Design a protein around this ligand. Structure first.
Ligand SMILES: Nc1nc2c(ncn2[C@@H]2O[C@H](COP(=O)(O)OP(=O)(O)OP(O)(O)=S)[C@@H](O)[C@H]2O)c(=O)[nH]1
Ligand SMILES: [Mg+2]
Length: 171
């Protein structure tokens, strides 16, 4: 079985837990509960095979900074998550998240994921697709993908690209 460990990191409340649950279960939590950590195992049928995804959920809050590195060992892919309506979370990718990840698991491939894309509107300085593409280039991510756990947009694409960058026949 082709398996991989995918870890999700990013500011508090960007939508990390909802991403994993909307992807793997097809529905999100009715009540928002901040994560300490959580590990899921999910079978995804893709390209005529079944892949075992070990999904590692982490705490976006800095109160848990000391604990989070405990989740990074042997990570195949890291999802650098921000919410497109929270520019601070976007900026924090470059200053906090990508560096933290490159410190503890520099061998993992990174995927930039712009969450809550359902909330994006002109005239509020939301993170645009171009900005995400620019950052993906700057940080050397495999891709920038936009998603909404609520509207069910881009969910499979996040995890298909995660599988691809590890097991595919091409970049
Ligand atoms: N509109 C919209 N709201 C979302 C979306 N994803 C998550 N949310 C909401 O944002 C809030 C935080 O989502 P959640 O997934 O729990 O954040 P988190 O990144 O896991 O937060 P933490 O555990 O590190 S504190 C919740 O109220 C959730 O319903 C989305 O795609 N669109
Ligand atoms: Mg969470």
């Amino acid at each position: 079985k082709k398996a991989l460990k995918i870890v999700v990191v990013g500011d508090g409340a960007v939508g990390k837990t909802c991403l994993l649950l909307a992807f793997s279960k097809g529905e999100i939590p009715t009540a928002y509960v901040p994560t300490v950590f959580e590990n899921f195992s999910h079978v995804m049928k893709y390209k005529n095979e079944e892949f075992i995804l070990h999904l590692w959920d982490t705490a976006g809050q800095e109160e848990y900074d000391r604990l989070r590195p405990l989740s990074y060992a042997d990570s195949d892919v890291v999802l650098l998550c921000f919410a497109v309506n929270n520019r601070t979370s976007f900026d924090n990718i470059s200053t906090k998240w990508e560096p933290e990840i490159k410190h503890y698991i520099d061998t993992a491939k990174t995927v930039l994921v712009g969450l809550k894309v359902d909330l994006r509107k002109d005239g509020s300085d939301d993170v645009t697709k171009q900005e995400g593409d620019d950052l993906c280039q700057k940080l050397g991510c495999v891709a920038y993908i936009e998603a909404s756990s609520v509207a069910k947009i881009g969910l499979n694409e996040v995890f298909e690209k995660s599988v691809d960058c590890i097991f595919s026949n091409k970049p």
